[PDB]
């Protein structure tokens, strides 16, 4: 027998629970943990094919694809409004969220070890067969609504609409045509195979996913409940719920569910999030001025002038100037040589 | 809470946006984020086999091989012109770019989840057989318009060259051939299977690729966007695009789309790259003379007549006089310099 | 001049399969913005 010690001063965590916790404002950056989930979006056909796409075709052809929503998982979003960190200020170092850790996960395996209600039979005397046939687990969350870049190949493909697919087909669309740039601002809109990050246009989202080819791929899961993911970086900063409104993203192709005739349809599933949060300081740059200017713009119309900047030029001129030069030899200097022989 | 907490004395972006930025004035470290990307070169049959190759042969022979371009990816390359730090620069310290981070990524798969559209019905009431196979995603980044090194089997082949293959067709061309040394200095021309690093020379390029042989071989990604790879080393360097022009280099075989006919043909896809650049300062490393020789003589004529030059010499002797000294009693010596000291040899 | 020369892809100007440069140097006491703004043609439209 030996002696007993401590407990500690505890950053309170009276606050507790689900969605309720949002409700207020609290003592400095205290910090909080959040349990939610967002469900799947397979573009599904059913409520039996809940967490599943519709069974699939094998072929069609380039020229000939146009599905319907039902085999078309689109991203699972929800935009999550968090209460403030920001409300009667002007200026100063203001606060955005930097939410510190999350574990979130595509949730729901154990039942799919059933192949004895059938699945599709493996063969032999052998029972059903699982689900599997490539899988993607991915998510990205960002404090921004997500700039996508749609990618098709086969721009002689077709598909519907709210199945917001990469928009504007070209040969180039097959290796993306500049367009197809989108914004995640609709729970399940962008069928996942159609949209791709306009990623470096999404700094303030962090994505990770692996799409996991082969052609049946045995999956593996790891419920070692301890990985912690910190929502930071090299500076130790994550995405910012700048807008304390959150664009949450994932795709988690659980695999292909082998509907009984080898009809396969995806199983994709719901995601969970357990979100460890903190109140973070930035520096207002949002002040009055910006409003003022804001103001004027509404206050205006929008006249159809004529266009002379960017791609519409008839303005010919951007140069900086600069304070009293001495007397260089010349002021025209090639800062990239242009080799063509050289 | 919200709060005027000391809000990080973060760096200073000044502007960003593409190409326009280059033109800029000077600001020491200076450093930059390149969000580029390259489209693939597959032998790209067309606008649909735009980013994909032509299909391929199946049981053959060296002998039974003439290539033609379409199936032939060659590596994708570029001179990216890079700013000149040195336009004015006149100091005895020299600035150069030294190359700091890339997080690049082969980009935009998502259509390729078609088990549909001609994806050879594997069977069942399940789907197709889409793409896949081996994949090689690779890139090399050079500072240089690099040393390639050609690799051929099959010098019973009948190869193209727009898809500039290596030349030379010894047995030894089938193993190393020290002559199939080349140099990538060409968009879609080194067909990939044909060419290999002359890595003995590749020292001022960094490449990373992992060629991933195998029948269908799965693509397992990662889509992080949250940790670069850094282009430094012991001496903190990557390629040296000494070249303020950029040698860009790549191959990204996604695998092969398998048509319903098993028309299999490589599929390649574009890579995005995200580069971090700084200004590194050096010494002089090379002298005036070595330079001078140029201007001068270059904006000039040649003089050579009866032959002297070389060795064809109505030239006569090259020796060393010099000094005035007592009397070595061999003085019609043969006076040398072993090189480091004086060799003094004769027959007398 | 002395250099050898090549063909590749056009990564600049119009013909750029590059996308972007993001100028750094200096510092600053961390604003709010996780981007840049300037004109109300940046910010506005």
Numbering used by the authors:
A (entry chain 3): 15 to 356
B (entry chain 2): 15 to 362
C (entry chain 6): 312 to 356
What text appears in the publication on this structure?
BK polyomavirus is the causative agent of several diseases in transplant patients and the immunosuppressed. The crystal structures of these viruses revealed that polyomavirus capsids consist of 360 copies of the major capsid protein VP1 (Liddington et al., 1991). These VP1 molecules form 72 pentameric structures, or pentons, that form the basic building block (or capsomere) of the capsid. Each penton consists of a ring of five β-barrel-containing VP1 monomers (Nilsson et al., 2005). Together these form a T = 7d lattice, with an invading arm comprised of the C termini of each VP1 undergoing exchange with neighboring pentons to stabilize the capsid shell.
Images of unstained, frozen-hydrated virions and VLPs were recorded using an electron microscope with a direct electron-detecting camera, allowing us to determine the solution structures of the virion to 7.6 Å and VLP to 9.1 Å. Each penton contains five copies of the major structural protein VP1, and there are six distinct conformations of VP1 in the shell. A homology model of the BK VP1 asymmetric unit was generated based on SV40 using the SWISS-MODEL server and flexibly fitted into the corresponding density of the virion map. At the resolution presented, the gross fold of BK VP1 is extremely similar to previous structures of the non-human polyomavirus, SV40, which shares 81.7% sequence identity in the major structural protein. Strong density is observed inside the virion, as two ∼24-Å thick radial shells separated by a gap of ∼28 Å. Interestingly, the density associated with the N termini of chains 3 and 6 appear to be a weaker feature within the virion map. We propose that these densities correspond to some portion of the 13–15 N-terminal residues of VP1, which are not resolved in previous polyomavirus structures.
